[PDB]
Amino acid sequence: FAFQAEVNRMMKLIINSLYKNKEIFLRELISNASDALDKIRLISLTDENALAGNEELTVKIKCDKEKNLLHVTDTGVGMTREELVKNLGTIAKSGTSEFLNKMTEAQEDGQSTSELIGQFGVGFYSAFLVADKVIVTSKHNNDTQHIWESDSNEFSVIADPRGNTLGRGTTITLVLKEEASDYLELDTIKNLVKKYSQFINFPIYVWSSKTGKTVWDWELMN
Amino acid sequence: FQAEVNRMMKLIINSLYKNKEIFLRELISNASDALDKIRLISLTDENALAGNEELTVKIKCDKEKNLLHVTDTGVGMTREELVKNLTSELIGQFGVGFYSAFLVADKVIVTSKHNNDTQHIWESDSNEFSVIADPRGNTLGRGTTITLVLKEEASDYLELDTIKNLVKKYSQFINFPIYVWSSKTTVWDWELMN
Numbered sequence: 001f002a003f004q005a006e007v008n009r010m011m012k013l014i015i016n017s018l019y020k021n022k023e024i025f026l027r028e029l030i031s032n033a034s035d036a037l038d039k040i041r042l043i044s045l046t047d048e049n050a051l052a053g054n055e056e057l058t059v060k061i062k063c064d065k066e067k068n069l070l071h072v073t074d075t076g077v078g079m080t081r082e083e084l085v086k087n088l089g090t091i092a093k094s095g096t097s098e099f100l101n102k103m104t105e106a107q108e109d110g111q112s113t114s115e116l117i118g119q120f121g122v123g124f125y126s127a128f129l130v131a132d133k134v135i136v137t138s139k140h141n142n143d144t145q146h147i148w149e150s151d152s153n154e155f156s157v158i159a160d161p162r163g164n165t166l167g168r169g170t171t172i173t174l175v176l177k178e179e180a181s182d183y184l185e186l187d188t189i190k191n192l193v194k195k196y197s198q199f200i201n202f203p204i205y206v207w208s209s210k211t212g213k214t215v216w217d218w219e220l221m222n
Numbered sequence: 223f224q225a226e227v228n229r230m231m232k233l234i235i236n237s238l239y240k241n242k243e244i245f246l247r248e249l250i251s252n253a254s255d256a257l258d259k260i261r262l263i264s265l266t267d268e269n270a271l272a273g274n275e276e277l278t279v280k281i282k283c284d285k286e287k288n289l290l291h292v293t294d295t296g297v298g299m300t301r302e303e304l305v306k307n308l309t310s311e312l313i314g315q316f317g318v319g320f321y322s323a324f325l326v327a328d329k330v331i332v333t334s335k336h337n338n339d340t341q342h343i344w345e346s347d348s349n350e351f352s353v354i355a356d357p358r359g360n361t362l363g364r365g366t367t368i369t370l371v372l373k374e375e376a377s378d379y380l381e382l383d384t385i386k387n388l389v390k391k392y393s394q395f396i397n398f399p400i401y402v403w404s405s406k407t408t409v410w411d412w413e414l415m416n
């Protein structure tokens with residue numbers, strides 16, 4: 001079961017190389033954060049206690065060069081354990097068996113190679129254009145806080161032992177590929193965030209520096 | 223088992239559908255990129271276009287010799303760049319990049335003249351390749367001609383109307399004029415497509 005994995009993994013490295021502008025992954029994550037915030041905002045207009053777990057409605061992005069991570073946190077509706085498993089799990093899980101079934105299916109169904117490569121640049125899966133691993137921490141009003149992890153081959157989900165630290169919402173943590181180190185650069189992230197947040201109805205911030213000494217804090221990008 | 227994995231992927235990549243016509247989209251794309259590099263350069267180097275004053279892409283069909291020519295007056299490539307700039311085959315399988323030409327061609331000949339070198343000819347069948355200084359001298363002025371020796375089954379890409387429709391299809395947003403050598407009611411000249 002090691003050879004199939006070498007073909008699976010390699011197949012992805014080639015398709016990723018077709019994406020010169022991988023920056024779209026950030027547009028997709030912001031779009032999902034926006035959708036989650038709109039959902040809880042809509043709910044709050046009917047239920048006065050819907051925001052009890054976390055009164056703010058924001059998207060906050062932070063870089064961690066030491067750990068080589070990019071965090072995109074929203075205080076949207078969040079996801080229950082089942083949602084992490086059914087929604088993200090089926091989407092991210094493209095291992096040996098999954099990738100082949102989708103291939104033959106695409107083969108039979110008459111799906112163009114173009115239609116295939118395009119699936120790599122849209123939605124949640126687009127995170128893998130720049131990440132070796134994706135970690136999702138989420139808290140939905142109807143469940144406890146959970147952590148989901150995937151390398152695009154397998155995925156696991158376990159209750160967060162830190163308990164409810166998000167209040168409500170989701171953090172998408174990307175363990176970036178070596179060649180995606182550019183997305184750990186403050187100037188690049190601020191530029192891209194500003195680029196894709198022009199239509200979201202909520203404040204988006206990037207953890208940035210400001211200069212008695214250099215202090216870091218949330219900087220409004222839209 | 224690298225070659226094995228490579229062979230497997232190649233078999234897989236081609237096990238899916240893809241209109242090989244996308245080769246033209248890729249050639250027009252490359253021509254655009256080359257024209258942009260020299261266009262920009264001309265904004266800082268007053269005489270950069272001295273070798274060839276126009277910024278165009280001209281397509282020619284040679285049914286007789288079974289050849290398709292895509293000539294741009296872009297930046298061109300030096301001898302070193304032809305060897306260097308021209309895995310890649312896998313991407314070509316996906317219908318992307320220079321190597322997508324082999325989807326419709328048995329051999330690709332590239333003639334190029336860069337301001338910093340003499341005109342050269344690069345030839346390949348996707349397995350081996352050769353590069354030699356053009357005996358004809360500087361005939362392009364500046365730029366590149368991609369010459370495709372079309373496969374037997376790709377003979378359809380030599381018909382005027384066919385080529386024209388294809389070019390128009392993949393040149394709408396290109397920042398440069400694309401022409402196709404065509405006849406007019408016993409006249410022949412370049413016809414704009416975008």
Ligand SMILES: Nc1ncnc2c1ncn2[C@@H]1O[C@H](COP(=O)(O)OP(=O)(O)O)[C@@H](O)[C@H]1O
Pocket residue numbers: 028032033035036074076077078079087088091122123124125169170
């Ligand atoms: N930040 C988030 N908060 C809540 N749910 C999310 C988030 N990101 C993704 N999801 C869930 O994952 C699902 C799939 O996301 P995606 O692949 O982008 O497809 P789409 O947005 O078209 O539904 C979303 O529909 C939603 O159910």
Ligand SMILES: Nc1ncnc2c1ncn2[C@@H]1O[C@H](COP(=O)(O)OP(=O)(O)O)[C@@H](O)[C@H]1O
Pocket residue numbers: 248252253255256294296297298299307308318319320321365366
């Ligand atoms: N018409 C052309 N004029 C100058 N250079 C070209 C031309 N076509 C291809 N090249 C060179 O070949 C390289 C590889 O082309 P390609 O496989 O399409 O990849 P890409 O366009 O993404 O760089 C180009 O980057 C360029 O250096």
Ligand SMILES: [Mg+2]
Pocket residue numbers: 028031032123124
């Ligand atoms: Mg989405």
Ligand SMILES: [Mg+2]
Pocket residue numbers: 248251252318319320
């Ligand atoms: Mg190209």
